Amino acid sequence: AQTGTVKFTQPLPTGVEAYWTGDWKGGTAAEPARFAVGNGTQDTFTLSDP
Amino acid sequence: LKTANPFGLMVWCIILGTPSKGFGLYPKNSSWAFGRLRQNFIYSGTQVPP
């Protein structure tokens, strides 16, 4: 949580877009915030900037 | 909350003791250089387009 890196376990299919909400390093993401677009096989992603 | 006249605003300035320099009082005709005609003595499109 301090470094802002997230890991999915199962690889995501194509065209599945995720969002995230909460608070990080001061900035707030109350509204959904895009951080990942699963390309088909990758399961390691990182969070966005509020 | 609905004090519209500059009179009430200046009265509140006296009541609370704030200055009155930076506040614009009124755009009314009592202010200098306004009139119901007031087209005279200005660059009226014959001299320079303003």
Binding site: - | F7, V11, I14, I15, G17
Partner: protein, 404 residues
């Protein structure tokens, strides 16, 4: 403001009566024009009364001004009388001293006695007193002149052990229209700058307060005092009463960690050396720090040349006017306070405020040190500037006017 325009209160009644019936007269003072004149008078008076009631500004109001104060500011100063505690009292054995024994001090005191007392066989008893009038001259320890006493009462005196206080009176609307701008007793807002002056000024007998805060991280940034310790503030008061009241008031209006600061060797005399030990706290802890000073009593000189006026005007009028301004009795101008510089133009303005119809030609103002020999004739100049901790007063003899 918003109080004028009664000249057209006549044409309205004329048009009214004309519209009422045809077109006829309303002139030459018959019964019809007399009714018209009556309408004139009543309408004008009603509009005048409306304009008087409407304008309620602090610089305009009177008597109802107290509510303009009570909207924000603290209540006026109630009249009070100063009592005496533990006044020695000696007489024969087994005597009772009844209440309201009108003891009299030698400069026409007329003191009373609060609680009835019985003299013990030791012959030494202490009786509590109370003064009669709000205006009471500070007495001196002597044998108080006795008016009413028993068949056994021998004498009464004032020992050093007795502790006295001071009264309060003479709160005219001039002080109310002056202390509006400054004594903003924002009891609601305590830990701030404008709040400290007003909360301290609630203490009795206190005349004026100054509070200057650095707001920076370097020394010598305020108008008139040095710093030593940065991130702090220093307080100066005049006419100071006993320590504890002003100490509690000062401690009750701050919040910062170490905002207290003695200025430097160039500042008003500190009241106490290390601190002021404000013993009690709401948290019951034994915290002790209060630091504050008093001003330097300067002295000012005025000399002015004027004309002779419409008729004869004695110089006593001008002297009384300038002295009254200096004491601060005139409404609006606070006069001379801790941190106010004398100005020749301001003094001339005060003179014109009191006695008009006189033509002032020259004005001169000078300031002199405490107890110093009277300033030389070449000392006077147009403008003098006082620092933060400099208080100056003017007497009757410091102003001379030999006018052309």
């Amino acid at each position: 403001v918003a109080d004028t325009a009664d000249v057209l209160s006549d044409v309205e009644a004329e048009f009214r009566a004309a519209l009422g019936a045809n077109i006829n007269l309303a002139a030459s003072t018959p019964q019809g024009s007399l009714v018209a004149a009556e309408a004139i008078a009543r309408s004008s008076v009603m509009r005048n009364e409306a304009r008087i009631a409407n304008t309620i500004n602090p610089n305009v109001s009177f008597g109802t001004f107290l509510d303009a104060i009570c909207a924000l500011m603290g209540i006026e100063r109630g009249s009070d009388l100063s009592t005496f505690g533990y006044g020695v009292q000696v007489t024969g054995r087994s005597q009772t001293r009844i209440s309201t024994g009108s003891r009299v001090q030698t400069p026409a005191g007329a003191i009373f006695t609060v609680m009835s007392d019985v003299t013990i066989p030791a012959g030494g008893v202490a009786t509590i007193d109370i003064k009669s009038q709000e205006y009471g001259n500070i007495p001196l320890p002597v044998g108080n002149l006795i008016i009413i006493d028993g068949t056994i009462g021998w004498s009464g005196a004032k020992v050093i052990a007795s502790t006295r206080v001071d009264p309060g009176s003479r709160q005219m609307s001039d002080a109310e229209l002056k202390n509006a701008r400054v004594n903003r007793l924002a009891i609601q807002g305590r830990n701030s700058t404008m709040a400290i002056k007003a909360y301290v000024s609630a203490v009795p007998n206190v005349t004026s307060v100054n509070v200057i805060e650095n707001n920076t991280g370097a020394v010598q940034v305020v108008n008139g005092v040095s710093f030593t310790l940065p991130y702090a503030v220093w307080v100066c008061v005049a006419g100071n009463p006993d320590k504890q009241a002003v100490a509690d008031a000062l401690w009750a209006a701050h919040n910062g960690g170490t905002p207290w600061d003695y200025g430097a060797t160039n500042n008003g005399v500190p009241v106490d050396g290390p601190n002021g030990v404000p013993v009690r706290d709401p948290a019951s802890g034994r915290k002790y720090v209060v630091k504050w000073t008093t001003p330097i009593m300067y002295d000012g000189y005025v000399n002015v040349t004027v004309q002779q006026g419409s008729s004869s005007v004695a110089p006593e009028a001008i002297q009384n006017a300038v002295v009254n301004y200096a004491q601060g009795k005139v409404e609006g101008e606070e006069g001379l306070v801790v941190g106010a510089s004398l100005s020749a133009f301001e003094v001339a303005g005060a003179i014109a405020r009191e006695i008009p119809g006189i033509y002032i030609k020259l004005c001169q103002v000078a300031c002199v040190a405490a107890g110093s020999p009277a300033p030389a004739p070449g000392d006077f100049t147009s403008e003098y500037v006082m620092s933060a901790f400099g208080q100056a007063t003017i007497s009757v003899g410091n102003v001379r006017v030999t006018f052309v």
